[PDB]
């Protein structure tokens, strides 16, 4: 009966039943295989995290694109039968995706759902618009920036503005890699796959967004007041200085990792510029930030500052970035699925069988 | 007057005067101390090699990182006053390093130069780019793989592409250790430090790179035609079979020693992929192999094969690996130092004193 929402993010798999205010199964989208000889052939999610020291971990998803279907399928298997404990044929499902992903990706997923899982009916939604539902708004700009891919979708009074959707491949995993390089110059070394996950943990705890990056650098140079300590799994102590903010800074200056794209504050701005002047004001007053990377301390304030400078004077910049923004997409899914209007939008197996995979593009 | 170039490799210390086409002082970066009681407190380089049977030998450098400053300093002392016979305050010096070494390492070296040696001016350069100068090119990919650390730096028309520099700790010393383990299963035993050096000598003479590793294994199993004889210092005879190529194979399959990194042929490829499509062709046609590990017979051909498979069809893979590639870095140093443009880049003691150690990061 009750629809099952499943957010196939590139970082975490967030699944749960519609109507709830929180996902029930949240775990890493990771498949691990034994690096050495010896006992499972592979481990998934928390299993992989638990035994990661001896596993080669792979992400089946990259930048919102499924690259390894075998592993992808495996995760879904694991999800439905081990995490949620539910037969998929009992419930409608809601899957999500990032804007502009290759159509083959979308269709392939659908195929699997109507073959391996025999899902009664399904629907694929844009992560951004779901986030908007969670925010209680019909107008605003959704900035979804998680592990996989950053994107920006302007929405106005319940209407889409597809011609101004931005996509930026700069995301959480890139910040991770960048951070590794920085830790290297500091005096450490994180190069194994298991080490990658450690690095991630550090980032999530000690990084923050400087208000004025340059002054923050100066202060860091001036003294050790910003330095923090992080204890590694084996008891060693990591001392971190200016890396605590030099890392996340990359979001505003992608050039740090060789990208030509402007920072996310300009990406947002640009999307706004692509919309007709009549609605720009409304969008300025309703920026919605969501997704894991928007969890950095002070990122909203930094964002405000950046936009304020770019935007015309007097155009109040209001940024909405509430607690739990990390799960706003999943929440949106819960909402939408429970919405009775929406029920007409389900894609049934019946329709699929008759029309073929192309049907999903609707 | 004439600048003094000094390649602080982890294997050999290669020093000489700029303008020459070859280093004048080439000897092992080893400091040895008497294992038993008895006469010097320590021996350096060839001294250590000469009396190694009764010495505990240490390398002050590991993976391009100086771990023992006292011994490091000692080697420089020995170099300047015993090998080159020259007072350091008379000449500018050029030191080298591998990409991504910890900044503390870099600065510490500099400090020593401006204290113990009172060097007029100095400069620290990346080993990879020097190699490129030696090859007479402004575009290509430098694969520097010596004793200490393997690294890969893509260069295009005189510009650096830092966002795609690869570092791989797999190097000559790891091959040495791996070989030891193999010799063990063969029926021998090399565990002392002196024995280590013997093993190294064997490697440098009898190992080669199989074109098709699997077929080579089959042939080795089939007959003794590949077996060679190596006479040990005490007159014993070592008979070596498939170890003659199973050892170097590790460079293409790091998993042999428990590493997760892909082989060097994929490392190179990956670096290329990280560069914008527009210049990938130029890089494919200009691979430059240098450093001691690229001395194995047929490694270039093997490399070509490997890359050819990975690269798109028709993308001519040209690998440049000339005679004397072993010293291309030193040669590059000779060139650069003699270059008149470069003179503006020297870091003077004056500047150092005013700005402090941080100045080297430029």
């Amino acid at each position: 009966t009750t629809a099952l929402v499943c957010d196939n993010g590139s970082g975490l798999v967030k699944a749960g039943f519609a109507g709830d205010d929180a996902p029930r199964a949240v775990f890493p989208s990771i498949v691990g295989r034994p690096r050495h000889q010896g006992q499972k052939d592979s481990y998934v999610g928390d299993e992989a995290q638990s035994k990661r020291g001896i596993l080669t971990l792979k992400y089946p998803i990259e930048h919102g694109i499924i690259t390894n279907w075998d592993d992808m399928e495996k995760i879904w298997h694991h999800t439905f039968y081990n995490e949620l404990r539910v037969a998929p044929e009992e419930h409608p499902t809601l899957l999500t995706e990032a804007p502009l992903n290759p159509k083959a990706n979308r269709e392939k997923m659908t195929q699997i759902m109507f073959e391996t899982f025999n899902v009664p009916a399904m629907y694929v939604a844009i992560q951004a618009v779901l986030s908007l539902y969670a925010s209680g708004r019909t107008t605003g700009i959704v900035l979804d920036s998680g592990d996989g891919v950053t994107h920006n979708v302007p929405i106005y009074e319940g209407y889409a503005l597809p011609h101004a959707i931005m996509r930026l491949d700069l995301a959480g995993r890139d910040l991770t890699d960048y951070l590794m390089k920085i830790l290297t110059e500091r005096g450490y070394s994180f190069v194994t796959t298991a080490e990658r996950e450690i690095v991630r943990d550090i980032k999530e705890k000690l990084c923050y967004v400087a208000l004025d990056f340059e002054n923050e650098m100066a202060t860091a140079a001036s003294s050790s007041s910003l330095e923090k300590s992080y204890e590694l799994p084996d008891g060693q102590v990591i001392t971190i200085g200016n890396e605590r903010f030099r890392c996340p800074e990359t979001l505003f200056q992608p050039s740090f990792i060789g990208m030509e794209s402007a920072g996310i504050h300009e990406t947002t701005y640009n999307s706004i510029m692509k919309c007709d002047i009549d609605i720009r004001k409304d969008l300025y007053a309703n920026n919605v930030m969501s997704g894991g990377t928007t969890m950095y301390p002070g990122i909203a304030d930094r964002m405000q500052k950046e936009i304020t400078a770019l935007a015309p004077s007097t155009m109040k910049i209001k940024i909405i970035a509430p607690p739990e923004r990390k799960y706003s997409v999943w929440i949106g899914g819960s909402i939408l699925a429970s919405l009775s209007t929406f029920q007409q939008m389900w894609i049934t197996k019946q329709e699929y069988d008759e029309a073929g995979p192309s049907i999903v593009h609707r | 007057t004439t600048a003094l170039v000094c390649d602080n490799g982890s294997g050999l210390v290669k020093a000489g005067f700029a303008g020459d086409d070859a280093p004048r002082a080439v000897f092992p970066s080893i400091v040895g101390r008497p294992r038993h009681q008895g006469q010097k407190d320590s021996y350096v380089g060839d001294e250590a090699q000469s009396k190694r049977g009764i010495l505990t030998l240490k390398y002050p450098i590991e993976h391009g990182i100086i771990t023992n400053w006292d011994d490091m300093e000692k080697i420089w002392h020995h170099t300047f006053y015993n090998e080159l016979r020259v007072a350091p305050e008379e000449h500018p010096t050029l030191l080298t390093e591998a990409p991504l070494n910890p900044k503390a390492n870099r600065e510490k070296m500099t400090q020593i130069m401006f204290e113990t040696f009172n060097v007029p001016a100095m400069y620290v350069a990346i080993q990879a780019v020097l190699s490129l100068y030696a090859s007479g090119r402004t575009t290509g990919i430098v694969l520097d793989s010596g004793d200490g650390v393997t690294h890969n730096v893509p260069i295009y028309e005189g510009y650096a592409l830092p966002h795609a520099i690869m570092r791989l700790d797999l190097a000559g010393r790891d091959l040495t250790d791996y070989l030891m383990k193999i010799l063990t299963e063969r029926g021998y035993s090399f565990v002392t430090t002196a024995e280590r050096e013997i093993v190294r000598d064997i490697k440098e003479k009898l190992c080669y790179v199989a074109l098709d590793f699997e077929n080579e294994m089959a042939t080795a199993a089939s007959s003794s035609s590949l077996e060679k004889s190596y006479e040990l210092p005490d007159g014993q005879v070592i008979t070596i079979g498939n170890e003659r190529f199973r050892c170097p194979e590790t460079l293409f399959q790091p998993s042999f020693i428990g590493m997760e990194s892909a082989g060097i042929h994929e490392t190179t490829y990956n670096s290329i992929m990280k560069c914008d499509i527009d210049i990938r062709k130029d890089l494919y046609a200009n691979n430059v192999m240098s450093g001691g590990t690229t001395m194995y017979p047929g490694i270039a051909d093997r490399m070509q094969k490997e890359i050819t498979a990975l690269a798109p069809s028709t993308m001519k893979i040209k690998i440049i690996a000339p005679p004397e590639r072993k010293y291309s870095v030193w040669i590059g140093g000779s060139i650069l130092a003699s270059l008149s443009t470069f003179q503006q880049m020297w870091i003077t003691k004056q500047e150092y004193d005013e700005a402090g150690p941080s100045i080297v990061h430029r």
């Binding site: 990259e62 694109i65 690259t67 | -």
Partner: peptide, 7 residues
């Protein structure tokens, strides 16, 4: 991706 970037 099947061109540009990896995916």
């Amino acid at each position: 991706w099947x061109a540009x970037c990896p995916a």
